[PDB]
Structures are given as C-alpha cells and as structure tokens.
Design a protein around this nucleic acid. Sequence first.
RNA 1: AGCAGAGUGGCGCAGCGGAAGCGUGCUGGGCCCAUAACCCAGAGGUCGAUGGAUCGAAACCAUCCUCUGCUACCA
RNA 2: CGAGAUGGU
Lengths: 422, 266, 147
Amino acid sequence: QATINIGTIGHVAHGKSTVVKAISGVHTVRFKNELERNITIKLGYANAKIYKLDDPSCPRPECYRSCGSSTPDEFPTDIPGTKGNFKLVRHVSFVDCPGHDILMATMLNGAAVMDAALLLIAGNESCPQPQTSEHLAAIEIMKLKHILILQNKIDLVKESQAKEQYEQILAFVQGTVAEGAPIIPISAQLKYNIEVVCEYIVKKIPVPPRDFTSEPRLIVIRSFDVNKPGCEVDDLKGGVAGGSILKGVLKVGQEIEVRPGIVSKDSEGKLMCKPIFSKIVSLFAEHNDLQYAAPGGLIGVGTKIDPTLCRADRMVGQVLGAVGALPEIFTELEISYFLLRRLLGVRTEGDKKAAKVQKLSKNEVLMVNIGSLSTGGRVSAVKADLGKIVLTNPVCTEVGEKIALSRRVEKHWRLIGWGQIR
Amino acid sequence: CRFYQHKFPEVEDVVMVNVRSIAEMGAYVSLLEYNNIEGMILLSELSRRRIRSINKLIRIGRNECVVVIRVDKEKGYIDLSKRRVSPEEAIKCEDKFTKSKTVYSILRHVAEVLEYTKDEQLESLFQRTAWVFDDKYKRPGYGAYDAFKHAVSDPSILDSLDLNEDEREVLINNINRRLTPQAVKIRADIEVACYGYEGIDAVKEALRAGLNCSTETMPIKINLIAPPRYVMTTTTLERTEGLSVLNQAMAVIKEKIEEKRGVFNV
Amino acid sequence: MSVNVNRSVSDQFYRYKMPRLIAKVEGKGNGIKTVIVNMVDVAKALNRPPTYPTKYFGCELGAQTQFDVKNDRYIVNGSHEANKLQDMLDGFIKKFVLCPECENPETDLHVNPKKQTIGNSCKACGYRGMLDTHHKLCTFILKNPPE
RNA sequence: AGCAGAGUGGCGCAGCGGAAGCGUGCUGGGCCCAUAACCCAGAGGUCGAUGGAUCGAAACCAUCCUCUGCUACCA
RNA sequence: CGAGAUGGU
C-alpha cells in the first residue's frame, strides 16, 4: 500500500509535468479532448517508488544510466553504478495538489490527505512569491509540520536572482511559518539534480502514528476508473472511490459508509439527511488488486454505486468509516474565528490592497472547510470574531478542533482566516 | 417492349420521356414506358413566361416528365406539354417509372430461358402472371411490384399460376437484395440514474424484465450516449408495429427501480 | 499568418486575435467584383452577423455590396485589392467599439428596433451609451437586428 | 463510443440506384466601333480495402479503414 | 409599352 503520502503544491505559471515525472516516472493528467496547459489546475495523483543502489543516486528502471529525455538537443547522463541490483527505500505515492488559488478548498483537502508537503518554486514572477505563506500557515493550523521546498523552472535564471527569490521569501515568512524547510534546486528542462529531491524525501519526512485496530476511518476525494464497454450497460463494475485510510484495518465484504451522505427527497429542508453505506466489493493499490488494507496509504475502494456518480469528481473531500459510526454530522455550525494579518494571493512591486481583512456581516455566503471536506455557509448570527451558520451540504469530524474560512472579498472566494467549533 | 397493359397513353396524365431532336415548331421525343414511340412538345408549351434560351429548358438525351394533351389512335399521333406539370406530379412520375424499371429488369432477365429468339417471349412472359398481378389494381394505383412483395413473404401468389424457377428466384432477389437491411427503426430515451446501494445485484432484473414469455435465448440490444442518458432497442420491430413495445419497455425500465425504493419523473 | 484584431495597438500580448481576411478579384473592367472568402469565419471570430462588417466597407468606400444564400458569396463591387482595404481593416472596431477611456474593444450591442435606438456596452471599464448619429451603419442595424 | 459526411472528372458545393449532377469558378469563341451585361463550347479519367444482385457502381447492399462535424466517452 | 449602363489616341 504505502508508508507515507506526499503533496506536490505550488502556484500559477510554475509548471507541473516535468518535475512530477522526474520524482515518480508517472505523467499526472486529467482526460479531456483538448490541449494540456502549463498546470494540472485541480487535485490529482502520481503513483511511485523510491529506491537506491549501494551508493547515493536515483536510477531509472534500468539501473546502469540516468540518461534523460526531457530536451531534444542533449542526452544528460550519469552512472549510478555498474548495473547494480536496486533496493527499495520505502513505499510512497504523490498527491498532485491544485495549481491555482481558485481551488483553495480542494487545496486544503489535498494538504490534509498528504502526510508531508513538497512546495514548488519558479523564476516566472517577482521574488516575494506569496503561496509560501498561504499553504504553510494553513498546513501549520492543520498540524502537518512535514515540509520541503523544490526550485523547478530556473533553466535560464542567474544565481543572484535565484538568491533574491529565496531571501525575500525568507524575510516574508516571519509572521506565518517557521523557516526550517530545506530547499532543493533542479533543472526543469535538463533533469539536473532531481535525485536530490528523492534523497530529501528520505531525509526530512517521518512515518506518522496511526491506530491499526481502532474503528475504521477513511478520507475519499477521487472518482476512480469505470469504463463504457459492456454487454450489460448498467452497473457492470460499480463505482470506485479513491482515498487514504486514517484508522483501522479494512477488508473486502466489510460494510463501509460516508458520513454526510445526501439530503432525502420530499424533505422541507436540512432534516432527513442521512449517511450512505454498502459492502466493499474490491480493493486496488500499487498496480495490484487486494483483499485487505491498512491505515497510512493511498488506496482505491470498490463499491456498489452507479458509475454516473463517477463520470466526474462528485466525491471531493468526503469522510468514510464503519457502518453506524459515532462521529458527529453537522448541517449547521457554531463558530469562533481569527483573520490573517494581510490580504493574500498575489504580489508585485508595491501594495495592492494588502491591508487587514474587513469584518464579516450576515448578508453574505462563506466558503468554509473542516477536516478534509468543504461546504458553503450562510449566517444566522455573527460578530467580528464569533458566529452561528447553516450549511448548503453537511460535514463531519472526529473532533471540532479547527475550521478554515473564505470570503467573497472579490468575484470568487479567497481565504481570509481560520477558526474552531464552539 | 411495353411496360404496361395498353398500346397507347391516355389523355391528360403524366409520362416519362427522352428528347431526341429540336425543330422550328417543337421538340421530338420518345416515350419510355411504351416501346420508344414518337411524340412532340410544341415550343408554346414549355413555359408560362419569356424564354432566355431553349437549351436550358430542354437538351437532347435527358429524361423528362410531361402530360399528354391530345392522341389520335389510328395514325399514332401524340401531343405533349410541360407548362402543365406540378412538382408533386414529377415525383409521382419517378415513382411509377422506378416501380416499372425494377419489374422490367426482372422480366427481361427471366426471359433468358428456353429459345429466347424473339420479343414474342418477352410479350408472352409479360402476359399471364405479371399482367394479371396488376390489371386488377389499376384504379387503386398499385403495380406488380406489390404482388412480387407478397410473393416474397408467401409464394402462394406464384403457386396460383403456371410458373418458372428464374421467374420465382429473380423476382425474390430483386426485392430481398435491397430489403434484407430490415434495420432498427425505434429506440427509447431514459433520464434514469440509480439510488440503489445494492445496484450491481438489483439492476440485473431491470436490464432483463423488458418482455414476458420469451425463449431463454431471446436477445435485446442496449445502448448509451452518456451515463445519465440510457437507451434500449424494442426487440428489432419496425416503426409501424413496435409502438406498444416502446411504451411497455420505458414503463418496465422505471418500474424495476421504483419497485426497489427509487423515485423518478413519470 | 494571423493578426491582432486591431493594428492601432502594437502589443504582442493584446487581448484580441483573429485569422487573416482574404479576397478574390473577379471579372473584367466595367464589371469587376471583390469577393471576401473568410467572411463567415471572421464574423464568427468577431461575434457579429456577416452582413454588418460587409456593409461597413460599402459605407466607407462608396460602393455597392451583395449577399447570397444560394452561393454563400459576400461581395463588395469594384476592385479593392491590397491597401484599398488593408490600410483600413481595423475600421469595424476603430470607428464603433473602441472605448474612449481605454483601448479595449471587449464590447457588446443591443438593438431596440421599435424605438430607433442602438445600445452599446464595453466590459473593460464599464463604459455604456449608444452608437453615433452622424455615423453611417445605424440605418442598416435597426432594419437588421442581431440573432 | 452514439448519429452523420468525405474518399473528384476540373478550385469549391456534394446529386439520384444510368457512365458529371446543377448553381458557381477557370479557359476560349460569338454579339459591339469597344468594355460590361447576355449567348455557346471546352478540361487525357474503375472516386481507400474484401464479398454479392445488376445492362451498371463514388452513387443498391454487407464487412473493414481514417479524419472531421454535433452529442460527448474505451483514453 | 420585356431588358437596353459606359467612352485613351
């Protein structure tokens, strides 16, 4: 399955494809009859292995040469060793986090399903790049301290401008996160130095505690593969959920449920909403089928549901567990909150409305996030630090420790702060 | 040879013709449903309004639709007109001609049996079977093409008379080589997406309950434009008969999930 | 080749881009035609009916124009090769839908044909009003409202 | 993947179960003192593979191939 | 009461 799961995180115009291939061998993609843009804009994945010879290097699947293919005019090459037998370090897979702040709820969810972060940096915009606070301040508030930095698109950038970038970032983080994350430089075009990223995901990142025998918990985000061909057109395979198990051993034929579920038809409102549950039909990980599974790793879980739920990611940010589980389900929320010391998202040569956030009012709709879920929140009562709200879809958590808060401060919502349940 | 019952055309009806020459008073023409007999279109009968050139109304070797305005039976004189013909009547003329050319393409080929020395065999093969198969129906408006279509579904039409084996097989083939694509002409459209958490077991009745009392071998054909747009074929029946099976299938498709705690728009 | 929608702006990164407009000169003297070949694709790229940009050339040049459903040819009568259109190919933007506050033709029209008025609105800075009363094409637009 | 088009004889639009189909473009001739309008005539010819009825196959019917178009998915 | 514009030596 896996020992750890790592989120590749960044900002607009930094690229994706070359570096996600360099750390895994897998092209991150979403299927569309259209050209591939500079970024995978919405949350994805890349399956991987990490392995070495007897001496520090990251080989190809043929071990004798590191020979590249990312540039048409050159063959950059080194010898890891004289065709030595490879050794696996540990089982790992990557969470391909969103490329634009428009998906900030899905980004907080991606940052919750990872055990650690890779934060990606590029020369395409001015030095004090703001997502170095925006991700890492939320990541500290969701208590996930495990962080690394990766300087990607610098193929034509001088060492003094590469310095000015990391040094204006090192000055900027003083109010938002600890400086203690290592930086790895690479080439995006030449695949130079990329095996140091592999070494640092062994060097910096610990294996986290989980309970192997306590009651099942799972986070789901992805509608996994089901396909059109068949002699029976309905329910040939059933819908498959992509997720990561938080807690408990899991097995084929176990009854599993999703906590927020759905609102029942012919209800007059938020009443009569219920969980949804079924027996697990199959399991998938590491390009193999399974009968059993464990906490701490990315997995595909097979279910009896209609594939019409799976033709798109309807299942973004959902919490799952054993049938009839305890954890409280919220369709309305009691909140206490705090706001960021600057407005955030983009920057240039001098101030662009970067002042402190204006207080909330009841005539508005929030986007609000809890655990690894998301919902839209409408106000019943509020003050500048405290409130009471009703939710357009239900949400769930094992404890009400934290929430994250986004406001329509302009045409689409931006993060403005965080809070707790009362 | 002649395609029809009678020696000469009747007055004030439409014939298919081919143009041979143009002169000072009119164009000279051969009628096609008769044995290439001579007739003429007068230049006064071509248009209701001024003519910019004649060559773009008529040119030699092209097929044309015209009414017969006068006939003298004894001398063999026939007068033709184009000013009269409406476009519905031109479509009707092409249907009469196509239904006749197909029947004639059977009989001309069936005649290549016995001695076949003279057109006497063509006229002898046209008489009896093919003539009594449509002389009875001139007023209703059918031709022997419909009797041949009846002889395809039941050969008792042929068994009623003196017969030849080419006259059986060539007749059948000139329908069946074109009629054998008796293709699908009805399918259903359904908006259903399924609530059932037991669906991979439960929906296998809704996929198979669509008709009662079949053989266990009986197929149906099922289709999909996208997952929320389900489609089914009504047991390969034609659009003149499958309308009952269409209404039953869509009702059964919704029933075998509304029976199972689903709810949908009727 | 391809171009910016208007050449009064020299910027490589300008928001508006389109295919070339190419035309055939046809016939002989005392009876010459200029036929525009790309006109349906250019009208689709500019989000207008193909009658309006064709009619604007006849209004400026002092010439007859033809439209035909039987053959899909759009025609400006007389010879108008090279510079005779290409000095003024901007005009359908430059005399109608440039905002006076900023050089950004992200601009829409709405017609009230019962009340002799054409409404105008640009998304770039919120500029709104009507088309001009001395300008030619207003008499054609009110008799030919948009789809 | 559901449904549709194309597979020149001359640019381009693709007729109908008869060997160009018609409106149009090109080239030449007539008419006029001459140019346009109008009139007339030209252009070397199995139109992707494999079967079958025909006097006949780009155009009556199967089975494969490929790209577009609208829906919209094995990816 | 069809259609019938124009003009380097």
